[PDB]
Amino acid sequence: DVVMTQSPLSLPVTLGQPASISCKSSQSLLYTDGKTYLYWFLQRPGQSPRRLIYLVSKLDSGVPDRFSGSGSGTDFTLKISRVEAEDVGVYYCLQSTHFPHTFGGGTKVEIKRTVAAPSVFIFPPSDEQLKSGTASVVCLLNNFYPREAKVQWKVDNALQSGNSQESVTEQDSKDSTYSLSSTLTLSKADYEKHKVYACEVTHQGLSSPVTKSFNRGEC
């Protein structure tokens, strides 16, 4: 099988600057009809891959002229003349000159924007959930940059471990930020044994860590 080596894996770029993505094939991609079946796609978060380029350098209808493709034989490049916020996502090269057809590993373009502190919000479990025997406590970190953030759960000032899960959004196509949700899960019995529920957030945008808290039962 033809190995398609794509580089870099991660591509942080300043808004308005050019970008270059390399795709190197282990075999010539020149077919017997004189055509080179090398394609490029952009996969935006939660969307299907969308074709940008085909036949190395041909732009699909509707694709902005900021995108261009070049190369021959084994070394190919996708260039973006001036990166825009909506260009974030994962770019893939593909060869179909040889069977089986093979894709590059992908390149994730990230906008390197200014530091943005997260806005922190805490949510107690609903009375509806408490009736079912479980308590989910949610901490939200909204619209921050860079991605690096730490969430620490405290219950009556005791550090929690192994009872939380978190997930992070992909970089926003408009404001270039991330958001994160952390859920602390306890049994109703364990939840009722304690008073102070707190979420402590550490991030570059915060001069000192931010703690959001509530006292169980208070409206």
């Binding site: 009809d33 079946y37 394609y39 796609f41 299907s48 891959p49 969308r50 074709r51 085909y54 699909d60 893939y92 593909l94 179909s96 069977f99 089986p100 057809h101 093979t102 894709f103 590993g105 992908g106 806005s119 919000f121 949510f123 107690p124 479990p125 609903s126 009375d127 509806e128 959930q129 079912s132 989910s136 949610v138 939200l140 909204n142 619209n143 899960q165 978190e166 997930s167 992070v168 959004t169 958001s179 949700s181 859920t183 899960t185 409206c219």
Partner: protein, 214 residues
């Protein structure tokens, strides 16, 4: 060119995965898959005229066929295991002639297929109740398989919405949160409802989100 993709989103291990792709010339149709959080893998092709080509990595478990009269294409993958869990895509391109054909020009919306012996389970929806900005949301808990879709105010509220990737709990059920930031001044006047849809269990839940009563 529009591509409609259909098929079960849950398949038991050892059973056959079946997907359908309808194109609305002639066409060349390719199938591609993407395991969660990973890259793209090419599965196979059906050429204009019916010739096929498959990825040897599928160890001859794969079949692609075209309906005799319509541009409808079927993907069959036998003896599935958890390694076959992925979003499956069909992609088409024009076949003008033997000297002018293309590939991967138009892609369908993907179909997630989860290979599991577990039963479908609808979610429970709980409110995440709230100067100058307020946050609110919905916790969509204990469902299987993925995905769930969440909208706010029947699609009228899109700005400031963040629907997080689901997490798999130790119970083997998924949990997801959807949040929205709004002006704190809007809380007394504007109604906020999260619309949750879980197609595998045919569950549709509308949850009004408001502060807890004092």
């Amino acid at each position: 060119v529009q591509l409609q993709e259909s098929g079960p989103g849950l398949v038991k291990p050892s059973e056959t995965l079946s997907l359908t792709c309808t194109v609305s010339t002639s066409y060349i149709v390719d199938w591609i898959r993407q395991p969660p959080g990973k890259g793209l893998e090419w599965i196979g092709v059906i050429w204009a005229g019916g010739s096929t080509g498959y990825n040897s990595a599928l160890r001859s478990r794969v079949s692609i066929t075209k309906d005799t009269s319509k541009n409808q294409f079927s993907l069959k993958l036998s003896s599935v295991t958890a390694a076959d869990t992925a979003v499956y895509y069909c992609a088409s391109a024009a076949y003008y002639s033997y000297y002018n054909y293309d590939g991967f020009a138009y892609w369908g919306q993907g179909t997630l297929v989860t290979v599991s012996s577990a039963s479908t389970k609808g979610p429970s929806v709980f409110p995440l109740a709230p100067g100058g900005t307020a946050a609110l949301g919905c916790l969509v808990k204990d469902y299987f398989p993925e995905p769930v879709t969440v909208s706010w105010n029947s699609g009228a509220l899109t700005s400031g919405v963040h629907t997080f990737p689901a997490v798999l709990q130790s119970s083997g059920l998924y949990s997801l949160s959807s949040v929205v930031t709004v002006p704190s001044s809007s809380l007394g006047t504007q109604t906020y409802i999260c619309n949750v849809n879980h197609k595998p269990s045919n569950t549709k839940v509308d949850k009004k989100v408001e502060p807890k009563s004092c």
